Structure formats: C-alpha cells, structure tokens
Amino acid sequence: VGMSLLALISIFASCYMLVAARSKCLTPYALTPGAAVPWTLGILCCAPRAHA
Amino acid sequence: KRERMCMKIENDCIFEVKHEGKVTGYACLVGDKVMKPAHVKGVIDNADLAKLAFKKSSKYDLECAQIPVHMRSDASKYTHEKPEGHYNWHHGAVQYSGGRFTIPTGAGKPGDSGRPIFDNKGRVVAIVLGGANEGSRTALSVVTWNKDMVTRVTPEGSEEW
Amino acid sequence: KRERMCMKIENDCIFEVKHEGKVTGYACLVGDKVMKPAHVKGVIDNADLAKLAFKKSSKYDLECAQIPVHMRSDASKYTHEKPEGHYNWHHGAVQYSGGRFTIPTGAGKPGDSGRPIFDNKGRVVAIVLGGANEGSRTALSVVTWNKDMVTRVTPEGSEEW
C-alpha cells in the first residue's frame, strides 16, 4: 500500500505540473487577438482545437 | 471631434465594476477580448459579462474573457504601433516618450484602473493599471501590446489603483 | 458608376438556382471557372452549366466547374489582395477591417449565398456564404483567396444562408 500510494502521488504531481507548464506557456496568447502558431499548437495541445 | 469619438467609443466599450456598493474599476471591450485588472476585485456590472469564464494571468495583472457574439460589434479596434508623442485618455492627454507613459497632471485616482488609452485614430493602445508619482509627474504602470505579446510595463514606486 | 459596373458584371456573372419552385442560391463565373456554394442544393439555370462535372469540397463549402470556352469571354476578373477598407456588394457596401467582412446594414437573409463581392476596379474579392447576427450588424462567413490557395472564414454563430 505504501509503495502504491507513493507511485500515485508521483504520477499525479507530475501530470499536474505538466498541465501547469502548459497553461503558463500558453497564457499570453489568450490575452491578444492573435494566432496560435500551429508549430506551438501541434507540440502543445490546447482546448481550442480549431477556433483561434 | 477626437474627444467626441473617444467619448462614444468609451461609452460603448466601458462598463463599471461593482463591489460592496462601490466602483472598483472599469472593464473595456477591445477587439475580441474583455479585459479587467486582476488586482481590482469585484464583479462586472453586466449579466452577460458576469457569467463568462475569465482566464487570469497574475504575472500580467490581467483577467481576459471572450465576449458573447451579440456584443462583438460594440468593441473598439486595436493597434500594436507606438510612435513617440502624445495620446488621448479619459482625463485629457498622455505623453509617450522613451517607452514611458506620463500623466502631465497627476490627476489619476485609485479605482480608475481599466480605462483605455486611445490612439490619435481612436484605436486602443493600452489599459492603465496604476501611476507612480515622480516629482510633479505620474509615470504610468500600464499593460501594452507587442506584435503578439502582452507586456506589463511598471515604473519604480508604482501604486496599484 | 462603380455601382453600375458592379451591377452589370453581376448581370453577366450571376445565374439563378431553382429548387422546389423557390430560389436557393447563385453560381458565379470567375476567371475560367464557375463556382457555387456547396451547402445549398439546386440546379443551375443553364443547360451547358448543368451538365458540367462539379468538383465538390465540403471543408471549403464550395463547388467548382470548368467552364465551356464560349463563355470564357464573359468572365469576371479575380484578385488576391484585400486592402483594408470598403468594397462593393449587390446590397450596398461591405467593410473589411481586422480580417473580417461586416455588413453595416445588417439586413442579411437566407438564399443570397453566392453573390460576388467586388473590388473598387470591378475585380472580385470574395463570395458571400453565410451571416451571423452581430447585433445591429452581420458578420460574414465568406470564401476568399490567398496567392494560390482558397480559405474560408466563419465567425462564431454564423449560419449558412
């Protein structure tokens, strides 16, 4: 149980911190009426799949 | 003429923010984004703008949202060019020199955050956050735009209005 | 003058599309090819054109056909440049600002899809497909042209006419 719980903590923390990195990298583009730079979009997926 | 255009554009593109029965700031409609100073606490005085999802960026001190369609026509048009000189504002004129926006008069008061700065064409250039009192002048801690990057310029001693 | 040449070029490059006894759209001949809205259904009011094989594209919402040579002399002139400002239309003037086409009047109706939009010199710039009720205005979902590619712009909330 201890090893399993530590493994779950590791995986959740890592995935959450990737999500935070995603939002921080993509945050300035949601404050301008600009393009998403498909080079960034393809590597880094976002909620807007096609719009904006 | 320019003052009249600024006045109607502001009236069609500015809404006050209500908190505890007192105004805390203004929310403006530029292009396709509603902006609000993050440090300003309150709720926008509009039912449609009340329920929108707001995306916050504290390192930029700004909260941005997407306008409902029936209001996208009531938004000012923007620009990314900042030639040296002077520009319009709700309290008169502002001086853009050396990458610094200066209030000649120091007439800003707390709670005026969120009022747009206008171009000589009536286009929006920047949204004020606060002022720093240097001598008799007031440098502007303000949020402006690059080609596609938002930049929050802030002088030393600035106070969040 | 400009309106008159716009109207007569429309007379020479617009054909009615009938279905169940009512009008549905229009097919316009540009360059060396006829182009029709793909979303609308009907038949072209011409025996020569109705027999042509229409290359279909649903992602562009367009249908194309290669014209017979004997209407090549009745061909409008195309362009890829879209300078900021105003353009002609069968119901008045259209405004191109910030990458979007808008109708100042806001009188858009279904069944007018396929009406060309003209340039100042009578060249065609784009083709109306649908409209979104942008309050007192209507924003256009329109198929336009790059240097060698086709593009479609569809504002949120736009519905096909």
Coordinates of C-alpha atoms in Angstrom, one line a residue:
Chain A
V1 CA 0.0 0.0 0.0
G2 CA 2.8 2.4 0.8
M3 CA 4.6 1.9 -2.5
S4 CA 1.4 2.1 -4.5
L5 CA 0.4 5.4 -2.7
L6 CA 3.8 6.9 -3.4
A7 CA 3.6 5.9 -7.0
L8 CA 0.1 7.6 -7.3
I9 CA 1.5 10.7 -5.7
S10 CA 4.4 10.8 -8.1
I11 CA 2.2 10.3 -11.2
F12 CA -0.5 12.8 -10.2
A13 CA 2.1 15.5 -9.2
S14 CA 4.0 15.1 -12.5
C15 CA 0.9 15.2 -14.6
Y16 CA -0.5 18.3 -12.8
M17 CA 2.8 20.1 -13.1
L18 CA 2.9 19.4 -16.9
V19 CA -0.6 20.9 -17.0
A20 CA 0.6 24.0 -15.1
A21 CA 3.6 24.3 -17.5
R22 CA 1.2 24.1 -20.4
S23 CA -1.1 26.9 -19.1
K24 CA 1.9 29.1 -18.2
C25 CA 3.4 28.7 -21.7
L26 CA 0.1 29.3 -23.5
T27 CA -1.3 32.0 -21.2
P28 CA -0.1 35.2 -23.1
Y29 CA -1.7 34.1 -26.3
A30 CA -5.2 34.1 -24.8
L31 CA -4.9 37.8 -24.0
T32 CA -4.4 39.1 -27.5
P33 CA -6.5 38.7 -30.7
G34 CA -3.6 36.8 -32.3
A35 CA -2.8 33.4 -33.8
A36 CA -1.9 30.2 -32.0
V37 CA 1.2 29.5 -34.0
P38 CA 0.4 25.9 -35.2
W39 CA 4.1 25.0 -34.5
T40 CA 3.3 25.5 -30.8
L41 CA -0.2 24.0 -31.1
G42 CA 0.9 20.7 -32.6
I43 CA 3.5 20.0 -30.0
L44 CA 1.4 21.6 -27.2
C45 CA -2.3 20.7 -27.5
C46 CA -4.9 23.1 -26.2
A47 CA -8.6 23.4 -25.5
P48 CA -9.3 25.4 -28.8
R49 CA -8.8 22.6 -31.3
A50 CA -9.6 24.7 -34.4
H51 CA -11.0 28.1 -33.4
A52 CA -8.5 30.8 -32.6
Chain B
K1 CA -14.1 65.7 -32.7
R2 CA -11.4 63.4 -31.3
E3 CA -12.9 63.9 -27.8
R4 CA -16.4 63.1 -29.1
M5 CA -15.1 59.9 -30.8
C6 CA -13.3 58.9 -27.6
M7 CA -16.4 59.6 -25.6
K8 CA -18.8 57.4 -27.6
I9 CA -16.2 54.7 -28.0
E10 CA -15.7 54.6 -24.3
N11 CA -19.4 54.6 -23.6
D12 CA -20.0 51.7 -26.0
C13 CA -16.9 49.9 -24.7
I14 CA -16.6 50.5 -20.9
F15 CA -18.7 49.1 -18.0
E16 CA -18.1 49.7 -14.3
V17 CA -17.3 47.1 -11.8
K18 CA -19.4 46.9 -8.6
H19 CA -18.0 45.6 -5.3
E20 CA -19.6 46.3 -1.8
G21 CA -21.7 49.1 -3.4
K22 CA -18.7 51.0 -4.6
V23 CA -16.9 51.1 -8.0
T24 CA -13.6 49.4 -8.1
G25 CA -12.7 49.7 -11.8
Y26 CA -13.7 49.6 -15.4
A27 CA -13.9 46.8 -18.0
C28 CA -13.3 47.5 -21.7
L29 CA -14.1 45.7 -24.9
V30 CA -11.2 45.8 -27.4
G31 CA -11.1 43.6 -30.5
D32 CA -12.3 40.2 -29.3
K33 CA -11.3 40.2 -25.6
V34 CA -12.8 41.6 -22.4
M35 CA -10.1 42.9 -20.1
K36 CA -10.2 43.5 -16.3
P37 CA -7.4 44.4 -13.9
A38 CA -6.7 41.3 -11.8
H39 CA -5.8 43.3 -8.7
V40 CA -9.2 45.0 -9.0
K41 CA -11.7 42.9 -7.0
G42 CA -15.4 42.9 -7.9
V43 CA -18.0 41.9 -10.5
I44 CA -18.6 43.4 -13.9
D45 CA -21.9 45.4 -13.9
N46 CA -23.5 43.3 -16.7
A47 CA -25.4 40.0 -16.5
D48 CA -23.9 38.6 -19.8
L49 CA -20.4 39.7 -18.7
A50 CA -21.0 38.3 -15.2
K51 CA -21.2 34.6 -16.2
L52 CA -18.3 34.5 -18.7
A53 CA -15.3 32.3 -17.9
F54 CA -12.3 34.5 -17.1
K55 CA -8.7 33.5 -17.6
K56 CA -6.3 35.2 -15.2
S57 CA -2.6 35.9 -15.5
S58 CA -1.2 37.4 -12.3
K59 CA 2.3 37.9 -13.8
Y60 CA 0.5 40.2 -16.3
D61 CA -2.1 41.5 -13.7
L62 CA -5.0 40.9 -16.1
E63 CA -8.1 38.8 -16.5
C64 CA -9.4 38.2 -20.0
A65 CA -12.6 36.7 -21.4
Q66 CA -14.3 36.1 -24.7
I67 CA -17.3 38.3 -25.5
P68 CA -20.8 37.0 -26.3
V69 CA -21.5 37.3 -30.0
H70 CA -24.3 39.9 -29.7
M71 CA -21.7 42.4 -28.3
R72 CA -18.7 41.8 -30.5
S73 CA -19.8 44.8 -32.7
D74 CA -19.6 47.1 -29.6
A75 CA -15.8 46.7 -29.3
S76 CA -13.0 49.1 -30.2
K77 CA -10.3 48.2 -32.7
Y78 CA -6.7 47.9 -31.6
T79 CA -3.2 48.6 -32.8
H80 CA 0.4 47.5 -32.0
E81 CA 2.3 50.6 -33.1
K82 CA 3.5 53.1 -30.5
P83 CA 5.1 56.1 -32.3
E84 CA 6.6 58.7 -30.0
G85 CA 4.4 61.7 -29.0
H86 CA 1.1 62.1 -27.2
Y87 CA -2.2 60.2 -27.0
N88 CA -5.7 60.7 -25.7
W89 CA -7.3 59.5 -22.4
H90 CA -10.5 60.0 -20.4
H91 CA -8.7 62.6 -18.3
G92 CA -7.1 64.5 -21.2
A93 CA -3.7 63.8 -22.8
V94 CA -0.9 61.3 -22.0
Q95 CA 2.8 61.6 -23.1
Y96 CA 4.5 58.6 -24.6
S97 CA 8.2 59.3 -24.6
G98 CA 11.2 56.9 -24.2
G99 CA 8.9 53.9 -23.6
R100 CA 7.2 55.8 -20.7
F101 CA 3.6 56.9 -20.5
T102 CA 3.3 60.0 -18.3
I103 CA 0.4 61.9 -16.9
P104 CA 1.3 65.6 -17.0
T105 CA -1.2 66.5 -14.3
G106 CA -1.1 63.6 -11.8
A107 CA -4.9 63.6 -11.8
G108 CA -5.3 59.8 -11.5
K109 CA -7.2 58.4 -8.5
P110 CA -7.5 54.9 -7.1
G111 CA -10.3 53.0 -8.8
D112 CA -9.6 54.2 -12.3
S113 CA -7.7 51.1 -13.3
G114 CA -9.0 49.6 -16.6
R115 CA -9.6 52.9 -18.5
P116 CA -8.3 52.5 -22.1
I117 CA -5.6 54.8 -23.6
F118 CA -6.6 55.9 -27.1
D119 CA -4.6 56.4 -30.3
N120 CA -4.9 59.6 -32.3
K121 CA -7.2 57.5 -34.6
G122 CA -9.4 56.4 -31.7
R123 CA -7.8 53.0 -31.6
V124 CA -6.9 51.4 -28.2
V125 CA -3.2 51.1 -27.4
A126 CA -3.0 50.3 -23.7
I127 CA -5.0 49.7 -20.5
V128 CA -3.8 51.6 -17.4
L129 CA -3.1 49.8 -14.1
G130 CA -1.6 52.5 -11.9
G131 CA 0.5 55.5 -11.5
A132 CA 3.9 56.3 -10.0
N133 CA 4.4 59.8 -8.6
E134 CA 7.9 61.0 -9.7
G135 CA 8.2 64.7 -8.8
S136 CA 5.3 66.6 -10.4
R137 CA 4.7 63.9 -13.0
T138 CA 3.0 60.5 -12.9
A139 CA 4.5 57.6 -14.9
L140 CA 2.0 55.0 -15.9
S141 CA 2.2 51.4 -14.9
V142 CA 0.3 50.1 -17.9
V143 CA -0.3 47.0 -20.0
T144 CA 0.5 47.3 -23.7
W145 CA 1.0 45.0 -26.7
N146 CA 3.8 43.8 -28.9
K147 CA 3.1 42.2 -32.3
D148 CA 1.5 39.4 -30.4
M149 CA 2.9 39.7 -26.8
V150 CA 1.3 41.4 -23.8
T151 CA 3.8 43.4 -21.8
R152 CA 3.1 45.0 -18.4
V153 CA 5.4 48.0 -18.0
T154 CA 5.8 49.3 -14.5
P155 CA 7.9 52.1 -13.1
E156 CA 9.5 52.0 -9.7
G157 CA 7.2 53.2 -7.0
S158 CA 4.0 52.5 -8.9
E159 CA 0.9 52.0 -6.8
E160 CA -2.0 49.7 -7.9
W161 CA -5.0 52.0 -8.3
Chain C
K1 CA -20.6 54.5 -61.8
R2 CA -19.0 51.9 -59.5
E3 CA -22.4 50.6 -58.5
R4 CA -23.5 50.4 -62.2
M5 CA -20.5 48.4 -63.3
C6 CA -20.8 46.2 -60.2
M7 CA -24.5 45.6 -61.2
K8 CA -23.8 44.8 -64.9
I9 CA -20.9 42.5 -64.1
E10 CA -23.3 40.8 -61.7
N11 CA -25.8 40.6 -64.6
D12 CA -23.1 38.9 -66.8
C13 CA -21.8 36.6 -64.0
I14 CA -24.8 35.6 -61.9
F15 CA -27.2 32.8 -62.6
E16 CA -30.3 31.8 -60.5
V17 CA -30.6 28.5 -58.8
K18 CA -34.1 27.0 -58.5
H19 CA -35.4 24.2 -56.3
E20 CA -39.0 23.2 -55.5
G21 CA -40.0 26.3 -57.3
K22 CA -38.1 28.7 -55.0
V23 CA -34.8 30.4 -55.4
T24 CA -31.9 28.9 -53.3
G25 CA -28.6 30.5 -54.4
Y26 CA -26.5 31.7 -57.2
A27 CA -23.4 30.4 -59.1
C28 CA -20.9 33.0 -60.3
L29 CA -18.3 32.6 -63.1
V30 CA -14.8 34.0 -62.2
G31 CA -11.7 33.7 -64.2
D32 CA -12.2 30.5 -66.2
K33 CA -14.4 28.5 -63.7
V34 CA -17.9 28.6 -62.3
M35 CA -18.2 28.4 -58.5
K36 CA -21.3 27.6 -56.4
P37 CA -22.0 27.3 -52.7
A38 CA -21.7 23.6 -51.8
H39 CA -24.1 23.7 -48.9
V40 CA -27.0 24.9 -51.0
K41 CA -28.8 22.5 -53.2
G42 CA -30.5 23.2 -56.6
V43 CA -29.9 23.3 -60.3
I44 CA -28.2 26.0 -62.4
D45 CA -30.4 27.8 -64.9
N46 CA -28.3 26.7 -67.9
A47 CA -28.1 23.5 -70.0
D48 CA -24.4 23.8 -70.6
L49 CA -23.6 24.5 -67.0
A50 CA -25.9 21.9 -65.5
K51 CA -24.1 19.2 -67.4
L52 CA -20.7 20.0 -66.1
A53 CA -19.0 17.8 -63.5
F54 CA -18.8 19.8 -60.3
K55 CA -15.7 19.1 -58.2
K56 CA -17.0 19.1 -54.6
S57 CA -15.3 20.3 -51.4
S58 CA -17.2 20.3 -48.2
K59 CA -14.4 21.5 -46.0
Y60 CA -14.3 24.7 -48.1
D61 CA -18.1 24.5 -48.6
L62 CA -17.6 25.2 -52.4
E63 CA -18.4 23.5 -55.7
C64 CA -16.4 24.2 -58.9
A65 CA -16.7 23.5 -62.6
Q66 CA -14.5 24.2 -65.6
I67 CA -16.4 26.5 -68.0
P68 CA -17.0 25.9 -71.7
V69 CA -14.8 28.1 -73.8
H70 CA -17.7 30.1 -75.4
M71 CA -18.5 31.8 -72.0
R72 CA -14.8 32.5 -71.4
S73 CA -15.4 35.9 -72.9
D74 CA -18.0 36.7 -70.1
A75 CA -15.5 36.2 -67.2
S76 CA -15.1 38.5 -64.3
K77 CA -11.6 39.4 -63.0
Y78 CA -10.1 38.0 -59.8
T79 CA -7.5 39.2 -57.3
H80 CA -5.8 38.0 -54.2
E81 CA -5.2 41.4 -52.5
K82 CA -7.6 42.5 -49.7
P83 CA -6.6 46.1 -48.7
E84 CA -8.2 47.4 -45.6
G85 CA -11.4 49.4 -46.1
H86 CA -14.6 49.2 -48.1
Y87 CA -15.9 47.1 -51.0
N88 CA -19.0 46.9 -53.2
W89 CA -21.9 44.5 -52.8
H90 CA -25.2 43.9 -54.6
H91 CA -26.9 45.4 -51.5
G92 CA -24.6 48.2 -50.8
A93 CA -21.1 48.4 -49.2
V94 CA -19.2 45.9 -47.1
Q95 CA -16.5 46.8 -44.6
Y96 CA -13.2 44.8 -44.4
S97 CA -11.5 45.6 -41.1
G98 CA -9.4 43.3 -38.8
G99 CA -9.6 40.3 -41.1
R100 CA -13.4 40.1 -41.1
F101 CA -16.2 41.2 -43.5
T102 CA -19.1 43.0 -42.0
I103 CA -22.4 44.4 -43.4
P104 CA -23.1 47.8 -41.9
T105 CA -26.8 47.4 -42.6
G106 CA -27.4 44.1 -41.0
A107 CA -30.2 43.0 -43.5
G108 CA -28.8 39.6 -44.4
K109 CA -31.2 36.9 -45.5
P110 CA -31.0 33.2 -46.5
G111 CA -30.9 32.5 -50.2
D112 CA -28.3 35.1 -51.3
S113 CA -25.3 32.9 -50.9
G114 CA -23.1 33.0 -53.9
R115 CA -23.4 36.7 -54.6
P116 CA -19.9 38.0 -55.5
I117 CA -18.3 40.9 -53.6
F118 CA -16.3 43.3 -55.8
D119 CA -13.2 45.4 -55.6
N120 CA -13.0 49.1 -56.4
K121 CA -11.9 48.4 -60.0
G122 CA -14.6 45.8 -60.6
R123 CA -12.4 42.8 -59.7
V124 CA -14.0 40.2 -57.5
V125 CA -12.5 39.6 -54.0
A126 CA -14.7 37.0 -52.3
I127 CA -18.1 35.3 -52.3
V128 CA -20.8 35.5 -49.6
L129 CA -21.7 32.2 -47.9
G130 CA -23.4 33.0 -44.6
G131 CA -24.0 35.6 -42.0
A132 CA -24.0 35.9 -38.2
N133 CA -26.3 38.4 -36.5
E134 CA -23.7 40.6 -34.9
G135 CA -26.3 42.8 -33.1
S136 CA -27.1 45.7 -35.4
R137 CA -24.6 44.3 -37.9
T138 CA -24.0 41.0 -39.6
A139 CA -20.6 39.4 -39.8
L140 CA -19.9 37.3 -42.9
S141 CA -18.7 33.8 -43.3
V142 CA -17.0 34.0 -46.7
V143 CA -14.7 32.1 -49.0
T144 CA -11.7 34.2 -50.1
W145 CA -8.4 33.6 -51.9
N146 CA -4.8 33.6 -50.9
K147 CA -2.0 33.9 -53.5
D148 CA -2.6 30.3 -54.7
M149 CA -4.9 28.8 -52.1
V150 CA -8.5 29.0 -51.0
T151 CA -9.5 29.9 -47.5
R152 CA -12.9 30.1 -45.6
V153 CA -13.6 32.4 -42.7
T154 CA -16.5 31.5 -40.5
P155 CA -17.3 33.7 -37.4
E156 CA -18.7 32.0 -34.4
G157 CA -22.5 31.8 -34.5
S158 CA -22.7 32.2 -38.3
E159 CA -25.5 30.3 -40.0
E160 CA -25.5 29.4 -43.7
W161 CA -27.8 31.4 -45.9

